[PDB]
Design a protein around this ligand. Structure first.
Ligand SMILES: O=C1C[C@@H](c2ccc(O)cc2)Oc2cc(O)cc(O)c21
Ligand SMILES: O=C1C[C@@H](c2ccc(O)cc2)Oc2cc(O)cc(O)c21
Lengths: 334, 334
C-alpha cells in the first residue's frame, strides 16, 4: 500500500485530492494549520471513513514543519495556497514567501528519502501572461513552453501581477531545487476549476465559476477581464484535475509541466447555458454579449498525448455538481 | 524508397496528397479519368518536378482499371471524392456505385499483393448524424464510435441523406472487404477542409469555407445548416489533413477510423475573423448572429493521443492561403 501526502488539506483542491487518493486505496497524510479547528476541518473526519487519513500541523513559513507529514510518503502533492487579499509590498509579503514556503516543503521531501515524485499544483497564471501574444491582436495557441512574463509584470504591475510572478518563480525555484537534489518534480497548471469538493470553508477557487449565478462583483470582473484578454475563458472539472494529478504521479514517463483544461467557452455561451439550466438565478445572457475577439487559448494536448482521459467533457458535465456546492457554502442563496 | 498510389489526382485532396508525398520522398502513382485533359491535369506536369510521379487512366466505374496504378505500391490513398448526379433513385445512382467503386479499387490492392495499408478519405458526414442526440437539448462530444444513422436517413430522407448513407456504407463495406482479405484499412474523417492545393479545377471541396467571401448561396446554407445542428462548424487545413493521412499510413499502430479537425468556431466568430482579415469582400458579421445552441462537436483526440501534431492551429493559420487559391480558381471574383 502506497502512501501520499497532500498539503493544504483544508482547501478546495487539497480536500478533493484526499478524497480521490482514499478512493483509490492510498493511505493519506495531510497538513493543516490548526488540526483542532473542526469547523474548518470537519471533512477530514468524514474522509477517515474511506481509508487511512492522518492529519498533521504544518505552516509554509515554519521551516521543517512538514517533516513528519511527508515522511514515509511515496508521493507528495504540494497544493499551493491561494494569495487571498492584496498587500502593500507583494514582493516581500507574497512573492518571496511563496518561493521560500515551496522550498521549505521541498526540503522535507528530500529529507524523507522516500518520495518518488512531487506533484506541484500551480495554475495557468504561470503560463498565460504574454505581452506579445495577448497584445498583438492575433489569435494564438499557447502550450507548456509559455511562461508569464515576470519582467513585464514587475515593470507595469497590471492587476494580479503578483499572483503570476509568484507562481512562475516558485515553479522555477522548485524545479531548480528538484534538479540539484535528484527528486522528480512534475507541475500541473489548471485553468478555472469547477465542481464540488469536501472542504467546508472553500470559496476563493469557486467564486469565479459561480459568479454569473451569485452576482459576485469580483468574480464577474475577473471573467470579463479574461475574456477581454483571450476571447474566451477556460474551465476544468475539479475531479478531472484530481485524476490528472494522480495520473502524473503514477506514470513514470510524465515529465515537466502540464496545462489542465477541458472547455473554453465565451461568456455568452456560458451565460446562455447557465440561464437555461438554472433559471432561478435570473442570468441575463445579453449582459455578456461581446464582440468576437481573437482567441488566445491554452492547449490541452500534452496531458492527452501521455494517455490521460477527461471525464467531464461537455459544459454541462463540467457544471454537473458545483451549484449544490455553492448552496452548501452559502455562495448561492438557494 | 517507398511507392504510393493516390486516386483522384485531378481532385482537391488527391492533388495535395501527391504534393506532400513527393516532398517526403515517395515515388507516387496517381489515377485520373483522362490523363490528356490539361484543363484538369496541368498541375501533374508541375508536380513531376518534385519527384517520381507517374499518371494512369482509371475510372471507379470500370472494373480493374486501377490494377496498373496500384501495382508495386506500399500504400494506397483511396480518395473517394466524386459522388453522383442526384437522380430519382439515389440508391442506384449514388449509393450503390459509391460502394462498388470503392470495392473496385480495393480489389486492385489485393491483386497488387504489395499494399501494406490503404488509407480511405471519407468525411464526418459518416459520423455526425445522430438523431437520438441532435434534438435532445444537451451538448455532446461525438468520437469515432459514432456513426451516421443510415436507417433513420433512409426512413425520412432529409436533405443530403444519400451523401451520408453513401459514405457510411462504403466505409463499412471497404472495412468488411479489408478484413476478409487480411489487408490493413484505416479511414480518416475530415470536417470542412480549408487551403490551397495544386489542382487547377477543384471547386466543390473549397466552396463552403469561402462562401462568406463569395456569397455562394449553397455554401452559406450548408454552413448555417451545420451550425443550427451542432452550434458550431469545424475546420481543418488541407495540409494537416494530408499530413494526417501520411501519419496514419506510416504508423504501424494506427487502426480503425480517425476524425480530422482542428478549429470549431461559430459562424459569427468565423465571419468576424474573415471581415477583419479580408475587408475587401464586405462580410458583415451581423449576418451570422445566432443564439447559442448546445454544442455537438467531433472529438479530435484519437489522432492526438496516437502522436500526430497539427501545424495550422489558429483560425488565421487555417485560412493562411485559401483566399489566393479561391481567386485563382475563380470562386472569388477578385
Ligand atoms: O492569473 C490568473 C490565471 C487566469 C486564467 C484562467 C483561465 C483562463 O482561460 C485564462 C487565464 O485566471 C485567474 C483567475 C483568478 O481568480 C485569479 C488569477 O490570478 C488568475
Ligand atoms: O454535419 C456535418 C456534415 C458534413 C457534410 C458536408 C456535406 C454534406 O453533403 C454532408 C455532410 O460536414 C460537416 C463539417 C463540420 O465541421 C461539422 C459538421 O457537423 C458537418
Amino acid at each position: 500500500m502506497k502512501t501520499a501526502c497532500v498539503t493544504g488539506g483544508s482547501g478546495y483542491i487539497g480536500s478533493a485530492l484526499i478524497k480521490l487518493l482514499l478512493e483509490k486505496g492510498y493511505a493519506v497524510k495531510t497538513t493543516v494549520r490548526n488540526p483542532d479547528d473542526m469547523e474548518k476541518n470537519s471533512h477530514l473526519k468524514d474522509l477517515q471513513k474511506l481509508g487511512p487519513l492522518t492529519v498533521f500541523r504544518a505552516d509554509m513559513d515554519e521551516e521543517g514543519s512538514f517533516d513528519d507529514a511527508v515522511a514515509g510518503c511515496d508521493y507528495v502533492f504540494l497544493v499551493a495556497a491561494p494569495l487571498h487579499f492584496e498587500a502593500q509590498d507583494p514582493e516581500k509579503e507574497q512573492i518571496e514567501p511563496a518561493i521560500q514556503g515551496t522550498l521549505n516543503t521541498m526540503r522535507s521531501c528530500v529529507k524523507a528519502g522516500t518520495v518518488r515524485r512531487v506533484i506541484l499544483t500551480s495554475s495557468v497564471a504561470a503560463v498565460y501572461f504574454r505581452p506579445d501574444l495577448l497584445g498583438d491582436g492575433h489569435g494564438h495557441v499557447l502550450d507548456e513552453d509559455s511562461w508569464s512574463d515576470v519582467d513585464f509584470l514587475r515593470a507595469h504591475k497590471p492587476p494580479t501581477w503578483s499572483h503570476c510572478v509568484s507562481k512562475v518563480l516558485l515553479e522555477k525555484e522548485a524545479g531548480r531545487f528538484a534538479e540539484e537534489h535528484g527528486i522528480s518534480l512534475v507541475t500541473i497548471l489548471p485553468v478555472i476549476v469547477v465542481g464540488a469538493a469536501p472542504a467546508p470553508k472553500a470559496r476563493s477557487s469557486i467564486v469565479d465559476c459561480l459568479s454569473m449565478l451569485s452576482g459576485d462583483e469580483a468574480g464577474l470582473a475577473m471573467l470579463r477581464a479574461i475574456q477581454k484578454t483571450s476571447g474566451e475563458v477556460q474551465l476544468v472539472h475539479v475531479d478531472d484535475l484530481c485524476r490528472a494529478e494522480l495520473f502524473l504521479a503514477e506514470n513514470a514517463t510524465a515529465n515537466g509541466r502540464y496545462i489542465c483544461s477541458r472547455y473554453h467557452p465565451t461568456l455568452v455561451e456560458l451565460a446562455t447555458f447557465l440561464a437555461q439550466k438554472y433559471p432561478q438565478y435570473g442570468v441575463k445572457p445579453t449582459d455578456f454579449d461581446d464582440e468576437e475577439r481573437p482567441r488566445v487559448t491554452m492547449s490541452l494536448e500534452k496531458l492527452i498525448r501521455e494517455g490521460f482521459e477527461y471525464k467531464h467533457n461537455t459544459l454541462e458535465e463540467i457544471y454537473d455538481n458545483v451549484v449544490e456546492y455553492g448552496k452548501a457554502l452559502g455562495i448561492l442563496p438557494y
